[PDB]
Every structure is written in structure tokens, then in C-alpha cells.
Design a protein around this ligand. Structure first.
Ligand SMILES: COC(=O)CN(CCCCCNCc1ccc(-c2ccccc2)c(Cl)c1)S(=O)(=O)c1ccc2ncsc2c1
Length: 331
């Protein structure tokens, strides 16, 4: 039998209609810029595959961020660089400015345009319904753009969204897990961070697509409006699907595995159990009411859905009533 195949409801054949070099990144030659142009100022972060530094380009004296990579397969470095190049100049997409090798350490280093990230202290406590609507709109601009350019990000989460609230700016970053959509293709499922993995990942359904991104956007929206970070708080990959099941109910889950004839690790059968889909109102309190609205919950419900094929698209999301004010305040 085997799993039932799936296509993407949108942007399906986008990459097919492009020159192979667009998506066949293994093909891609990298021209190394001059590592002496940049001097590193201070470390900004550390993140498993990369370290990040603020640095200055002594050619012209512009501030800049350098991401020094830890060893990864060249094919994956190529992949990140091609996607960044393909996406450069796109809405709220980080801008890759240069690529440099240390002459000795041989570690590759991506250089980006400087963007400031306002502290999560000043942010979280002062956001308000409006600001969240705004920035969710900004994220959807990026997701619709990358999806329309045949790319799925595969690691949407707070840590990969930078907000410069002084200048009401937002950038979607860390494209090192993004990959190109191709109809037919079975992809690796152990991608994204645990709280944001869609159910397709958790059940080992590999023929997924851009729709994966929309699940994690939902996971973000959820923890913002209910102020519950992370929203689905699983202790391991299995229990993660249990946390979801405990909100979205087990009935819709099994319908999903049936529709796509997915083989569930017998392990899950003894852990999922029987659960009702919960109404959103039991996550609402006094402390968070001000972010929760009928439109917020309609929007959220239409992202957080086991069946990838039935989640909103990025465009659909942008057209939802939840954003009616941000689309008018921007015209
Ligand atoms: C390894 O990474 C780190 O150590 C942290 N980095 C930056 C990440 C900062 C975390 C951003 N979280 C803020 C955030 C994001 C989204 C929301 C939001 C969610 C739902 C609705 C509306 C908003 C919120 Cl509240 C906060 S970082 O290293 O310094 C850094 C800085 C600049 C830069 N430029 C290109 S890559 C890069 C990396």
C-alpha cells in the first residue's frame, strides 16, 4: 500500500518552470569574498550550526552581521546560499551581502545586512493585539514570497524572526533548513524545532510542502495570543503529537492518518489515547484577553490543522479578517 502521495495546493510547479541552476544547488559554485574586509566586533549569538557576530566592513564602514558556520555538508551550505540569493530583496527576507572563508580555519562565513533585534523584554510586555497582527502580516509577506519562489523555510519560530520595533521592521532569518518544493519529493522529517514541528513530521509523512510553514506560524500565533511559550510543550517528539492531540483532538488525527494511509509507530498507539478537540476559550485568561478576539481564533483554527492540505495558504492568511486593519492602515 504505502502512504498516499500529496502535492501542494499552490506554487506547485514553480521550480519546474525555472532553469535547473535555480534549484539544482549542488551545481552552485561559490565565489569567496575577502575575509579581510570585515573585522568582528562582538558575538551576538550561538546556535548549534553557527555563531553570529556584529562586525564592520572596513571598505565602507557599514555595520554588518557575520554568521560563521560550523562544519556542514557543502551541499547544505550551497543550499543556504542559493536560497538566500534566490530570495534576496524579497519582502522581509534577510539580505546576504557577502560570503567569506577564513584563509586558515576554512570555516565559511555568511555576511548579512545589519538588522537590530529589540530585546524580548521591551517586546513581549508591550506588544498589543495590533502589533501582533502587524508582525504576523509581515511574516506572511515573507512566507508567501518564499513559497511563491518555490522554497519552504522549514524552521519558522520566534528565534528566526527578528523585530526592529523602533523602525517597525521584520526579517525572516536562518535559512539553513529551507529547501525547494518539488511535486513528488519525499523530504526529511526531523527538521524544525520540536514545539513547531507539524504533524506530518511527527508521523513520518515525508511528502510535505510549504504548508509545513503555516503550522509553525500557527504555533507562534498561539503562544503569542495565549501567552503560553511554547504552546505545544512536548517532552519528546512523540509526546509533542500528544500535546497537539490533547488540543485538536484524536478524532481528526486518525482521520488524517487514514486519508493518507500513514503507518504510525506502534509506540504512538499506546500514548495518544482518546481526546476531544478543545475550544480555544480554555486558554483565555484575564492576562491575555486583550490579544484574543473571534477573528484571532478563526485565523488560528484555520492554520492549526493536522491535514497539511487544509491549512490556510500564506495568501489566504493575509486576506483573513484578522488583518483587515493592518491592510487598511498600510494604504
Ligand atoms: C543563533 O541566533 C542567536 O543567538 C540569536 N540571533 C537573533 C535572534 C533573535 C530572536 C528574535 N525573537 C524575537 C521575536 C520574534 C517574533 C515574535 C512574534 C511572534 C508572533 C507574533 C508577533 C511577533 C516576537 Cl514577540 C519576538 S542573533 O544571533 O542575535 C542574530 C542577529 C542578527 C542576525 N542577522 C542575520 S542572522 C542574525 C542572528
Amino acid at each position: 500500500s504505502g502512504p498516499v502521495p500529496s502535492r501542494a495546493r499552490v506554487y506547485t510547479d514553480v521550480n519546474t518552470h525555472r532553469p535547473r541552476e535555480y534549484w539544482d544547488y549542488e551545481s552552485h559554485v561559490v565565489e569567496w569574498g575577502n575575509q579581510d574586509d570585515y573585522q568582528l566586533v562582538r558575538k551576538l549569538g550561538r546556535g548549534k550550526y553557527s555563531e553570529v557576530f556584529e562586525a564592520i566592513n572596513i571598505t565602507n564602514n557599514e555595520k554588518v552581521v557575520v554568521k560563521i558556520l560550523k562544519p556542514v555538508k557543502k551541499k547544505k551550505i550551497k543550499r543556504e546560499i542559493k536560497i538566500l540569493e534566490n530570495l534576496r530583496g524579497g519582502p522581509n527576507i534577510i539580505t546576504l551581502a557577502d560570503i567569506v572563508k577564513d584563509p586558515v580555519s576554512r570555516t565559511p562565513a555568511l555576511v548579512f545586512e545589519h538588522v537590530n533585534n529589540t530585546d524580548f523584554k521591551q517586546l513581549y510586555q508591550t506588544l498589543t493585539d495590533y502589533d501582533i497582527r502587524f508582525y504576523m502580516y509581515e511574516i506572511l509577506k515573507a512566507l508567501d514570497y518564499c513559497h511563491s519562489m518555490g522554497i519552504m523555510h522549514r524552521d519558522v519560530k520566534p528565534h528566526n524572526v527578528m523585530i526592529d520595533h523602533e523602525h517597525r521592521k521584520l526579517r525572516l532569518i536562518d535559512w539553513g533548513l529551507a529547501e525547494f518544493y518539488h511535486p513528488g519529493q519525499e523530504y526529511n522529517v526531523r527538521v524544525a524545532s520540536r514545539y513547531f514541528k507539524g504533524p506530518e513530521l511527527l508521523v513520518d509523512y515525508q511528502m510535505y510542502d510549504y504548508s509545513l510553514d503555516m503550522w509553525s506560524l500557527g504555533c507562534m500565533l498561539a503562544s503569542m495570543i495565549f501567552r503560553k511559550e511554547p504552546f505545544f510543550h512536548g517532552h519528546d517528539n512523540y509526546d509533542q503529537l500528544v500535546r497537539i492531540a490533547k488540543v485538536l483532538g484524536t478524532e481528526d488525527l486518525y482521520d488524517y492518518i487514514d486519508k493518507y494511509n500513514i503507518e504510525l509507530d506502534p509506540r504512538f498507539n499506546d500514548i495518544l489515547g482518546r481526546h476531544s478537540r478543545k475550544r480555544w476559550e480554555r486558554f483565555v485568561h484575564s492576562e491575555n484577553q486583550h490579544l484574543v478576539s473571534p477573528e484571532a481564533l478563526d485565523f488560528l483554527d484555520k492554520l492549526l490543522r493536522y491535514d497539511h492540505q487544509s491549512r490556510l495558504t500564506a495568501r489566504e492568511a493575509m486576506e483573513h479578517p484578522y488583518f483587515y486593519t493592518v491592510v487598511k492602515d498600510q494604504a
